[PDB]
């Protein structure tokens, strides 16, 4: 819930995407697979997912 994070890498139907702060406003599906996350401390967190919808914002 509203954690500060440095970066995130999704898997979608069109392909594999990555996101940073102030990425372009977009919304899209999530392919059934893995999701990578990278905090500001250099560590990582992987989550297996079952579909979904990513909602990225310009803010």
């Amino acid at each position: 819930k509203q954690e500060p994070v440095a970066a995130i890498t999704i898997r979608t139907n069109e392909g594999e995407m990555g996101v940073l702060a102030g990425h372009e406003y977009t919304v899209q599906q999530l392919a059934p697979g893995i999701l990578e996350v990278e905090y500001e401390g250099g560590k990582k967190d992987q989550y297996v997912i079952s579909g979904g919808f990513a909602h990225v914002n310009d803010t």
């Binding site: 102030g22 372009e24 406003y25 310009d58």
Partner: protein, 81 residues
């Protein structure tokens, strides 16, 4: 052998046509430089201010080659006989 030195004054204007033919090619980069800005500000209004100097940069440095082509057009004629 036999030596002939020929000076074709009609060549004073034949190169200018081919030079003028390429004057309009950099235009292809002008709108392409502007188009990316139009989409960019659409995709992100917040960044429209920071991208405009680079549209001006690539625009002027694209139009410079047409400038020097027109310079060739002027130099081919107004100094040569």
């Amino acid at each position: 052998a036999i030596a002939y030195e020929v000076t074709v004054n009609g060549a004073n204007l034949i190169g200018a046509g081919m030079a003028a033919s390429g004057v309009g090619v950099p235009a292809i980069g002008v709108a392409m430089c502007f188009s990316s800005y139009m989409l960019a500000a659409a995709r992100q209004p917040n960044m429209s201010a920071k991208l405009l100097p680079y549209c001006i940069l690539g625009f002027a440095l694209s139009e410079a080659l047409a400038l020097f082509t027109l310079l060739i057009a002027l130099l081919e004629l107004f100094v040569f006989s």
